[PDB]
Enzyme design. Structure first.
Site, PDB file in Angstrom:
ATOM      1  N   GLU A 294       0.789  -1.232   0.000  1.00 36.20           N
ATOM      2  CA  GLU A 294       0.000   0.000   0.000  1.00 36.20           C
ATOM      3  C   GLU A 294       0.824   1.286   0.000  1.00 36.20           C
ATOM      4  OE1 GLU A 294      -3.034   0.666  -0.628  1.00 36.20           O
ATOM      5  OE2 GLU A 294      -2.683   2.802  -0.272  1.00 36.20           O
ATOM      6  N   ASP A 295       1.105   1.790  -1.197  1.00 33.57           N
ATOM      7  CA  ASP A 295       1.762   3.079  -1.369  1.00 33.57           C
ATOM      8  C   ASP A 295       3.035   3.224  -0.544  1.00 33.57           C
ATOM      9  OD1 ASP A 295      -0.129   3.965  -3.186  1.00 33.57           O
ATOM     10  OD2 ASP A 295      -1.392   4.883  -1.645  1.00 33.57           O
TER      11      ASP A 295
END
Ligand SMILES: [Mg+2]
Ligand SMILES: [Mg+2]
Ligand SMILES: [Zn+2]
Ligand SMILES: [Zn+2]
Ligand SMILES: [Zn+2]
Ligand SMILES: [Zn+2]
Ligand SMILES: [Zn+2]
Lengths: 49, 538, 275, 117, 50, 49, 67, 46, 576
Positions: B155-156
């Site tokens: 996630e990012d």
């Protein structure tokens, strides 16, 4: 005398506009800093269209 | 084509663009004119008659890239990427840290971030030359491997090589320029720049003026921290009302000496003194600080895939190639397909082959180059897997990984998101007695906000006592005495003897209640409006 | 223990900048770990103390200081002889745990002057300094052996500084790493099938694949085991690569012996008995 | 920095010890040892060295956290054969092999003062 | 309770009461001290027709 | 400002070659904020007389 | 800018091979031949040098860098 | 302390402990510079 | 204005009571840590240096407590202040003899915050009851909060740069109160939709799919390696799945080890595989396409998310019921640890190869488009002849626009279906889509084949350029490109025109998102201000703040929604 008009950077009246990069660095100016925005109280100011 | 040669002649002699305008082979065109003109997409294909559904074309585009703006022009093949990601890049590109001009030394802006070793894009759009981007890059083309690893890149985010950080990975300087002015404070009252001693002045709370010079200013090159007095000045006030002996060396010399906010640490970069249109004497000082990449700090790809540093590892721990090449970055594969950012892969694939070629590739979205197979065929020629995928050895067990890895160079952004400036906490400190609320924020060491919705959740939580601790104890605690005769809060209260409720002649039937102080104020505010609210357990 | 590997060794190729060899009869875990030893584990001397006396050049001291770190000091003088400054119980530093360096330059000339490692001198007893025409009274220099250009100076710029080189190792910081990328290969034919290699024609052949040269797209053996690891050490210049390997091999053994001594100490300190 | 210095990765505090020894409270002739300021790099050859021993009923290790510098080892051997001897045997065998590896390396490098051809 | 000014304790008449702006605390070092009260800090409040 | 509700932002087709479609802030001012095209130009005003 | 020694991807030195490269460029307008002569057989090292750029000379272009 | 003002444009130290109105010899400009600190300063090469 | 001061406009109500600042709280950016237990939260040392707890002295720990006082502020395991019974507090930083300082039982000591302490953590913005949960601290380097991946799931946090807020209670009631309620393990099932809120995702979900493969085989050495990763284990090595020609273990055997040993979840493989409704019945080689586990032992079946959670029939919900939150949380942490370690060694990537399909099919797909292009022309010419028949209850234009739309949809679907066929199961992309991660077939169409028609409010691109979209087009043009149809793939690239239409729709999603983001906060406020007036009572009847009855009992049963489950009654059986 009627007033002091704030001038846009790189204006025709911005006499640095004729100076070379070498002149500008001689002035300690950035050759890739075309301006086009006023300096007000030492702060840089840009008009939004 | 001869006119092009004239354009070439212009590099030495002359042939102005205006002459090209004067040539009338090109014209300048508004939208009203566009409504009537028959615009052509390309000179080549449209001039064909074999499939001329129309040939009534009147004008043609110089190049479709001319639609693009400053930001979009940076990312290659935006059309192989999901469209909003580019808008996110356009915003995030603006968010990136980087150089901005040449004479940084003369510049003393309040805030600046410059990279030690910037790099021009390995894959570039030709227009960026006109944008002078290669002159002033704002990132570097790092060689990245796409793999989930340990999920710390989920996630990012991304896992990065700490040992690369040791070589000077994305390390940067931070410059903050401080300015301070001296000025009148009345007919006689004024600030006075100086180096006052603890006994010759007051308002010094506890801070010392050791760093100062006799002028009251700290020396250039001095090591600084978030507590000491940066500029020393003091203002005497009454000059005569003090009179008679409450003399002291502090006299009326009230402190107004400037100090640093309780957070920054570093070294003094520069000190400059001058005067302005106001005429008042003022000084400007630049403070240098160093920004190094750390876990959690925000970073970004050129393809609008931002991410923070999830963690950093030594080169040995990292999985490695046949050579033992550890990637600079470890990105989660899955983040790309959901966003559908194929262009991100093209930077890597073009970058890989360009690096091997030792020659730069153009990043224009529109080409006849057949970037898919030809590059892939060429990648095979340098002696590599034609798709770019390659096997790597384990960083710990050394064993070859079951899956094959797509690895290669990519232009990356260091984003303006100092996480250590984003953190904020407090357990106790300065408050706001006017409302008994915590201070406004971190730049005044305040408490953290509590919102309506956390309350709403807390009701839904049912944990009333925690809210009570939070609303009362963790923010606004108070004790009040009320007269038994009347719910009206009225006491004089000798806070060592008597209490009493005047107007009720109460002498003993006093009672104590716990409410918020800010709430008591509201209640007093109602009384000022001639309202007499009262309250009892009965 | 009844049986152990014979750790077959074969050296293929060596230079002052690299060493290529093949190790056989050994565990893969040993090969990676010793490989991890080659980088991080090797002790080296590097600058830890820098004072800048004067700087009228354009760059800021911390830029140079980081660079002073980036300087590839040769370690060919048994740098291991110096005690660690922490353990040397000396006031912060001493020649028994530090080397001293000083640099002073001023550009009086009108043209741009260049600054180099040579401007930096080891004030401490001449333990082999930076690699800049000091090793090479040899007619085999790269082009000048001016290895590092410190900075450039236009007319009027000056630089005065002092430095202390101190003992450390790669694990501490990469500047103390005496090695670049380390080459490694086992089983090119992928008989172990550690990865699929779908359509092996899409995979060019490795130089070691050549030995097992084959046009059968990848022979296979399920009973196979990692063997014939191919090595090529790439030294950064700080030391001769094979000599780096010996120091690495010595260090790992020493690292283990101390744990055994501690292991004895664990059983000594414990109430347990063994004999 | 809000993070410890680099030497802290391997350097032990004066109150720390490199390894800690605990008996298993679950199965006979088993123990769990904790090693501080160390990684899987050491752990993996030793597990393998113990795995090479057929007297071993169980052997395994892990860091408590990758960021953390510590490992724990659980080992079980035959009831006549203590897990301590297995660790002791494994290290002594491994150190011995390393010395010969070094000596053959010395023989291998020494075997070309000039050239092999 | 009029003896406030800048110095008192229950065990001794205070000799010094340092203002710790950082934590926003009032400390009396020679005994232990927390004379209580941080009023919102003056060092926090040192940035502040006819 | 003047003329509000049932007007919004999306895009007009004539903007093609006049403004970069991607160059906009991700804030609420999205689409509300525009940016000059690479080679677009603005009339300065003249006298047709 | 000011060519960092050691290729971030590997560690290959280049503390003087920039100007040599620039020398190689003036001597030979073949980057491949230039890149090869420098000994940067690895493209990670090649990317290091290929994508390097040195604006300092423009910084040097100023006269006043005197105080 | 001999330190105290190295004009910006004449590029010269004024050098005194004075409460002068930031003036400068020969060079009328007010732009002042302050000397490097006279203190022990350790730097690491990290 | 005295009324105004009160009035709410930044007044005593809204500007003070409805929202204020508090102490004992921290907020930073978030970072991931699958190694963390679901109750753990990673916490910066500086915060831990900043955070403290005032403990009341007891004779059982007074000596240690005194050591914290003696350790003082000069280190983390020390104490900053001590608060005496009579109320006196002492700064140990300026105390002349911090170590020699006297102390007794009943005094309070402000010691630094320590690990294992329970805190309450919150999202901001806060949208539901799981948005605020009690957490266990973990003191770590760097000023980052590290969390378990699956804790991101109810939070919907993103490490793109989100901050979230944490609060540390200072009362033992509240510590119990947080521990007995606010703690995350109880938060697993939502009463809003009687479903679980936890969800294992992305890398973890993909490797699990990978792990269920029939071709998964393990070695004894690695089994020991895997066993140590276990957060808990019986201490008893399992029997090899294979003995000859060589001893081996299966991943399904080992996954079943992770599984608690007396509970089962069946019926929902929920994967595309096998077939829809009758093919897999086609004899019962029940096969690897359907999921089945018995006595904590997985028989067959590639896993999905509907199995893995946040849905009905999920393993997660039944474990919560049988094993309870405490056993389920330890199983969940354990599995994530194991799958992560296996994934780490197994590895996973993605490349242009994953975008590669068969040329001939790719050749057939374009030619399928060519026929559709030809199909549009047949429709255009008939309308131009006015020989085209309008659909009943619709205009000819409505028919025409509809008719072209079916074609652009049928072709894209056909060419898409060719791409679904054209991809190997070897692919990471198909692997990513199948696993239930962030992907689908339409994605494949868009990346490999065709993005499809762009539209405005569902309508083809309007003629803003005077009966045209662009001057590149002829007047009265009706081509699908002339109306926004993106025929190319993300691999093929986009025409200048298609990119613009693609950019326009991206605005529609983004503008709607920004508007939707502001409005939800407002609508909720309208909703909350109403519904805050009601609570359950002890007589089971639902009542308000003035004690009036809303319902005879909550939900007409008084039972918990979490204890409700989807069931078939099947008494409505056809034949009597
Ligand atoms: Mg989010
Ligand atoms: Mg997310
Ligand atoms: Zn009364
Ligand atoms: Zn010493
Ligand atoms: Zn006192
Ligand atoms: Zn390299
Ligand atoms: Zn002057």
């Amino acid at each position: 005398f009627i007033g002091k008009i704030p001038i846009m950077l790189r204006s025709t009246y911005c006499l640095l506009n004729g100076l070379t990069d070498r002149d500008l660095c001689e002035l300690n100016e950035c050759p890739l800093d075309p301006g086009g925005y006023f300096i007000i109280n030492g702060s840089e100011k840009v008009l939004i269209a | 084509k001869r006119h092009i040669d004239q354009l070439k002649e212009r590099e030495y002699n002359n042939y102005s663009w205006q002459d090209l305008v004067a040539s009338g082979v090109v014209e300048y065109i508004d939208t009203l004119e566009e409504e009537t003109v028959m615009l052509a997409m390309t000179p080549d294909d449209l001039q064909e008659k074999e499939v001329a559904y129309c040939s009534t074309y009147t004008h043609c585009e110089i190049h479709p890239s001319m639609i693009l703006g400053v930001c979009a022009s940076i990312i290659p093949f935006p059309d192989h990427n999901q469209s909003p990601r580019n808008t996110y890049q356009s915003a995030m590109g603006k968010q990136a840290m980087g150089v901005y001009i040449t004479n940084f030394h003369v510049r003393m802006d309040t805030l600046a971030h410059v990279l030690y070793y910037p790099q021009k894009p390995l894959v570039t759009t030709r227009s960026m030359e006109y944008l002078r981007f290669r002159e002033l890059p704002a990132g570097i083309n790092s060689i990245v491997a796409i793999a989930s690893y340990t999920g710390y890149n989920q996630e990012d985010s991304v896992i990065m090589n700490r040992s690369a950080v040791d070589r000077g990975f994305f390390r940067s300087v931070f410059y903050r320029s401080y300015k301070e002015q001296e000025s009148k404070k009345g007919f006689d009252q004024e600030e006075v720049f100086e180096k006052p001693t603890r006994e010759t002045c007051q308002g010094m709370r506890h801070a010392i003026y050791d760093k100062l010079d006799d002028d009251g200013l700290i020396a250039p090159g001095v090591r600084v921290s978030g507590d000491d007095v940066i500029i020393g000045k003091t203002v005497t006030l009454p000059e005569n009302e003090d009179e008679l002996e409450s003399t002291n060396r502090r006299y009326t010399k009230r402190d107004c000496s400037t100090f640093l906010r309780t957070s920054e640490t570093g070294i003094v970069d520069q000190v400059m003194v001058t005067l302005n249109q106001e005429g008042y004497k003022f000084c400007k000082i630049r403070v240098r600080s160093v920004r190094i990449p750390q876990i959690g700090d925000k970073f970004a790809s050129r393809h609008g895939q931002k991410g923070t540093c999830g963690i950093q590892y030594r080169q040995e721990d990292m999985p490695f190639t046949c050579e033992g090449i550890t990637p600079d970055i470890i990105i989660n594969p899955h983040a790309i397909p959901s966003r559908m950012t194929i262009g991100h892969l093209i930077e890597c694939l073009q970058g890989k082959v360009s690096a091997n070629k030792g020659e730069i590739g153009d990043a224009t979205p529109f080409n006849d180059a057949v970037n898919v197979q030809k590059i892939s065929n060429l990648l095979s020629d340098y002696g590599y897997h034609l798709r770019g995928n390659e096997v790597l050895y384990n960083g710990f067990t050394g064993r070859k990984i079951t899956s094959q890895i797509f690895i290669g160079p990519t232009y990356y952004q260091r984003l303006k998101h100092m996480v250590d400036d984003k953190i904020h906490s407090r357990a106790r400190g300065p408050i706001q007695i006017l409302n008994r609320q915590p201070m406004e924020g971190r730049s005044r060491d305040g408490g953290l906000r509590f919102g309506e919705m956390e309350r709403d959740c807390q009701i839904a939580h049912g944990a009333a006592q925690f809210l009570r601790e939070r609303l009362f104890e963790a923010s606004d605690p108070y004790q009040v005495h009320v007269c038994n005769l009347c719910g009206i809060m009225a006491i004089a209260n000798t806070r060592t003897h008597t209490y009493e409720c005047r107007g009720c002649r109460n002498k003993t039937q006093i009672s104590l209640v716990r409410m918020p102080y800010a709430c008591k104020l509201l209640f007093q505010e109602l009384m000022s409006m001639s309202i007499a609210p009262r309250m009892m357990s009965v | 223990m009844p049986y152990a590997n014979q750790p077959t060794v074969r050296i293929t190729e060596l230079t002052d900048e690299n060493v290529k060899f093949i190790i056989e009869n050994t565990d893969l875990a040993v090969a990676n770990s010793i490989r991890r030893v080659f980088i991080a584990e090797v002790p080296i001397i590097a600058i830890d103390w820098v004072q800048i006396d004067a700087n009228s050049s354009v760059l800021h001291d911390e830029f140079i200081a980081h660079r002073l770190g980036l300087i590839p000091l040769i370690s060919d003088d048994i740098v291991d002889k110096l005690q660690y400054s922490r353990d040397c119980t000396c006031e912060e530093f001493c020649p028994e745990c530090s080397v001293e360096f000083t640099l002073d330059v001023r550009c009086n000339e009108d043209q741009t002057r260049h600054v180099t490692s040579r401007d930096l001198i080891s004030n401490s007893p001449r333990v082999i300094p930076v690699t800049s025409r000091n090793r090479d009274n040899d007619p085999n220099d790269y082009v000048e052996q001016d290895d590092i250009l410190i900075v450039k100076l236009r007319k009027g710029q000056e630089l005065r500084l002092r430095a202390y080189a101190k003992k450390g190792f790669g694990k501490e910081h990469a500047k103390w790493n005496p090695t670049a990328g380390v080459a490694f290969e086992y089983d090119p034919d992928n008989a172990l099938r550690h990865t699929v290699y779908p359509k092996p024609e899409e995979w060019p052949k490795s130089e070691y694949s050549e030995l097992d040269e084959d046009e059968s797209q990848a022979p296979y053996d399920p009973n196979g085991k990692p063997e014939r690891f191919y090595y090529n050490v790439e030294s950064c210049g700080s030391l001769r690569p094979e000599t780096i390997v010996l120091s690495a091999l010595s260090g790992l053994k020493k690292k283990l012996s101390d744990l055994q001594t501690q292991l004895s100490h664990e059983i000594q300190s414990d109430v347990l008995t063994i004999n | 920095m809000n993070a410890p210095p680099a030497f802290e990765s391997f350097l032990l505090f004066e109150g720390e010890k490199k390894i800690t020894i605990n008996k298993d409270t679950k199965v006979p002739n088993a123990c769990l040892f904790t090693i501080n300021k160390e990684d899987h790099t050491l752990g993996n050859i030793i597990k393998s060295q113990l795995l090479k021993d057929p007297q071993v009923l169980f052997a395994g290790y892990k860091v408590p956290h990758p960021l953390e510098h510590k490992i724990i080892i659980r080992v079980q051997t035959t009831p006549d054969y203590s897990p301590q001897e297995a660790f002791t045997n494994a290290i002594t065998d491994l150190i011995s092999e390393l010395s010969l590896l070094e000596e053959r390396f010395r023989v291998a490098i020494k075997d070309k003062q000039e050239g092999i051809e | 309770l009029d003896a406030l000014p800048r110095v008192t304790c229950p065990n001794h008449p205070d000799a010094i009461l340092v203002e710790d702006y950082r934590a926003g605390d009032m400390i009396c070092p020679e005994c232990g001290l927390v004379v209580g009260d941080r009023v919102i800090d003056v060092g926090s409040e040192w940035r502040t027709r006819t | 400002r003047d003329g509000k509700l049932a007007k919004p932002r999306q895009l007009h087709n004539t903007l093609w070659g006049m403004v970069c479609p991607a160059e906009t802030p991700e804030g609420h001012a999205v689409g509300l904020v525009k940016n000059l095209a690479l080679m677009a130009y603005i009339s300065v005003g003249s006298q047709p007389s | 800018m000011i060519i960092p020694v050691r290729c971030f991807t590997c560690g290959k030195i280049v503390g003087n091979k920039w100007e040599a490269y620039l020398g190689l460029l003036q001597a030979e307008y073949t980057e491949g031949d230039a890149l090869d002569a420098l000994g940067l057989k690895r493209y990670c090292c090649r990317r290091m040098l290929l994508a390097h750029v040195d604006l300092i000379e423009k910084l040097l272009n100023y006269a006043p860098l005197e105080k | 302390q001999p330190m105290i003002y190295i004009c910006g444009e004449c590029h010269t130290e004024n050098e005194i402990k004075s409460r002068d109105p930031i003036r400068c010899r020969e060079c009328g400009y007010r732009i002042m510079y302050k000397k490097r600190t006279k203190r022990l300063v350790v730097f690491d090469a990290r | 204005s005295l009324k105004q001061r009160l009035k709410g406009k930044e007044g005593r109500v809204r500007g003070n009571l409805m929202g204020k600042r508090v102490d004992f709280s921290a907020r930073t950016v978030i970072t991931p840590d699958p190694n963390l237990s679901i109750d753990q939260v990673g916490v910066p040392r500086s915060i831990a240096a900043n955070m403290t707890f005032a403990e009341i002295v007891t004779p059982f720990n007074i000596d240690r407590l005194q050591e914290l006082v003696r350790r003082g502020n000069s280190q983390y395991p020390g104490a900053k202040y001590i608060i005496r019974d009579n109320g006196d507090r002492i700064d140990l930083r300026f105390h002349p003899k911090p170590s020699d300082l006297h102390l007794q039982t009943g005094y309070k000591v402000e010691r630094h915050m320590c690990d294992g302490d329970i805190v309450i953590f919150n999202r901001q913005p806060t949208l539901h009851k799981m948005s605020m949960m009690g957490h266990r601290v973990r003191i770590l380097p760097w000023s980052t909060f590290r969390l378990n991946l699956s804790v991101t799931t109810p939070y919907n946090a993103d490490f793109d740069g989100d901050e979230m807020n944490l609060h540390l209670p200072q009362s033992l009631e509240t510590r119990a109160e947080i521990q007995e309620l606010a703690m995350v393990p109880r938060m697993i099932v939502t009463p809003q939709s009687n479903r679980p809120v936890m969800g294992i995702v992305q890398d973890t979900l993909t490797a699990v799919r990978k792990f269920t493969k029939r071709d998964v085989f393990l070695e004894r050495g690695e089994v020991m390696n895997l066993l140590m990763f276990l957060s808990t284990w019986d201490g008893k090595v399992p029997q090899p799945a294979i003995l000859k020609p060589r001893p081996l273990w299966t991943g399904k055997q080992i996954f079943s080890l992770i599984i608690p040993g007396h509970i089962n979840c069946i019926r929902t493989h929920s994967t595309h595989p096998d077939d829809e409704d009758s093919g897999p019945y086609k004899h019962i080689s029940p096969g690897d396409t359907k999921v089945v586990v018995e006595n904590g032992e997985l028989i067959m079946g590639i896993l999905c998310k509907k199995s893995l959670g946040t849905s009905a029939g999920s393993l997660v919900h039944i474990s919560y019921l049988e094993m309870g939150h405490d056993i389920t949380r330890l199983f969940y942490s354990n599995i994530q640890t194991v799958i992560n370690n296996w994934l780490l060694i197994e590895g996973h990537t993605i490349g242009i190869g994953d975008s590669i399909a068969d040329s001939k099919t790719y050749q057939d797909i374009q030619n399928t488009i060519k026929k559709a292009k030809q199909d549009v022309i047949e429709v255009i010419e008939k309308a131009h002849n006015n020989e085209l028949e309008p659909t009943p209850g619709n205009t000819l234009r409505q028919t025409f626009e509809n008719q072209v739309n079916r074609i652009l949809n049928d072709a894209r679907d056909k060419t898409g279906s060719s791409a679904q066929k054209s991809l190997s199961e070897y692919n990471n992309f198909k692997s990513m889509v199948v696993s239930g991660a962030k992907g689908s077939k339409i994605n494949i169409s868009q990346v490999i084949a065709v993005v499809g028609q762009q539209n405005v409010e569902g309508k083809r691109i309007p003629f803003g350029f005077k009966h045209r979209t662009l001057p590149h087009f002829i007047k009265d043009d009706y081509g699908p490109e002339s109306r926004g149809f993106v025929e190319n793939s993300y691999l093929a690239g986009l025409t200048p025109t298609e990119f613009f239409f693609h950019a326009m729709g991206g605005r529609e999603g983004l503008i709607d998102t920004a508007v939707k983001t502001a409005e939800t906060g407002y609508i909720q406020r309208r909703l909350i201000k109403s519904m805050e007036s009601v609570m359950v009572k002890y007589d089971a009847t639902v009542r308000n703040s003035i004690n009036q009855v809303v319902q005879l009992r909550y939900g007409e049963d008084g039972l918990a929604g979490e204890s409700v489950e989807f069931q078939n009654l099947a008494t409505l059986k056809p034949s009597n």
